[PDB]
Amino acid sequence: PRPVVLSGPSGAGKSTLLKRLLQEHSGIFGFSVSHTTRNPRPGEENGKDYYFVTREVMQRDIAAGDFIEHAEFSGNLYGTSKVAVQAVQAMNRICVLDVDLQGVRNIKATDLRPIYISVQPPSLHVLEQRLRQRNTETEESLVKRLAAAQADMESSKEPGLFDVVIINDSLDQAYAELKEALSEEIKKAQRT
Ligand SMILES: Nc1ncnc2c1ncn2[C@@H]1O[C@H](COP(=O)(O)OP(=O)(O)OP(O)(O)=S)[C@@H](O)[C@H]1O
Ligand SMILES: Nc1nc2c(ncn2[C@@H]2O[C@H](COP(=O)(O)O)[C@@H](O)[C@H]2O)c(=O)[nH]1
Ligand SMILES: [K+]
Numbered sequence: 001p002r003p004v005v006l007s008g009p010s011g012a013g014k015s016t017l018l019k020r021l022l023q024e025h026s027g028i029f030g031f032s033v034s035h036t037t038r039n040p041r042p043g044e045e046n047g048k049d050y051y052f053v054t055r056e057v058m059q060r061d062i063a064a065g066d067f068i069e070h071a072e073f074s075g076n077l078y079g080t081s082k083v084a085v086q087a088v089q090a091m092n093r094i095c096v097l098d099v100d101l102q103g104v105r106n107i108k109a110t111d112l113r114p115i116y117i118s119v120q121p122p123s124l125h126v127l128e129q130r131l132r133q134r135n136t137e138t139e140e141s142l143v144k145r146l147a148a149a150q151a152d153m154e155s156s157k158e159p160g161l162f163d164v165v166i167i168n169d170s171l172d173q174a175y176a177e178l179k180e181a182l183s184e185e186i187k188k189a190q191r192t
Pocket of ligand 1: 008009010011012013014015016017129130131132133134168169170171
């Protein structure tokens with residue numbers, strides 16, 4: 001039973017598929033609650049979606065060595081803390097992570113030994129509409145995320161970087177491809 005790392009462009013639907021997975025398989029998977037310096041969106045709860053901390057707190061923790069990995073994204077800091085992964089391990093659950101491309105390569109350097117899945121948009125055109133539908137991004141921050149998306153899409157074709165690439169055209173189909181990709185993960189977890 002290996003950890004799971006979900007990545008992809010902003011707005012692809014990796015958080016959506018993760019939420020569906022975590023509700024239907026609550027006893028099998030446990031979400032890695034990362035730290036972030038950005039403000040919480042409406043409907044986001046501190047401790048569940050993210051550990052919302054200020055910039056000074058994040059930098060203080062980085063010096064203290066609390067983070068397995070950390071990176072900046074659209075002028076805000078994100079990080080997978082050691083305590084976040086150890087919390088899921090203490091619950092006897094498969095840790096699932098939602099990081100960017102920079103985190104993916106950082107995790108490659110660690111010993112977490114995960115399975116890498118890239119949730120990809122059907123095309124870059126529909127990604128903008130997906131990002132524009134949520135409206136949480138201002139026009140300036142939307143362009144920054146859209147620009148970084150193409151770099152993420154290009155790197156998704158790198159051989160060996162991702163174990164599974166899922167195109168998120170149909171959400172039910174994308175979730176079906178997610179479960180099948182985790183079939184041996186769910187099997188091994190239930191096999192104990
Ligand atoms: N299958 C889908 N069909 C259409 N729109 C979708 C689909 N999945 C997600 N979206 C859109 O994508 C947004 C929600 O996806 P999220 O999971 O929050 O984005 P994300 O891939 O996690 O990237 P970030 O880092 O959270 S911005 C909304 O605007 C949805 O309308
Ligand atoms: N490297 C890294 N990236 C993260 C982490 N948490 C979220 N991200 C990434 O940061 C971006 C913004 O996330 P959002 O602010 O939309 O939740 C997404 O690409 C997401 O996957 C993290 O802990 N580490
Ligand atoms: K995350």
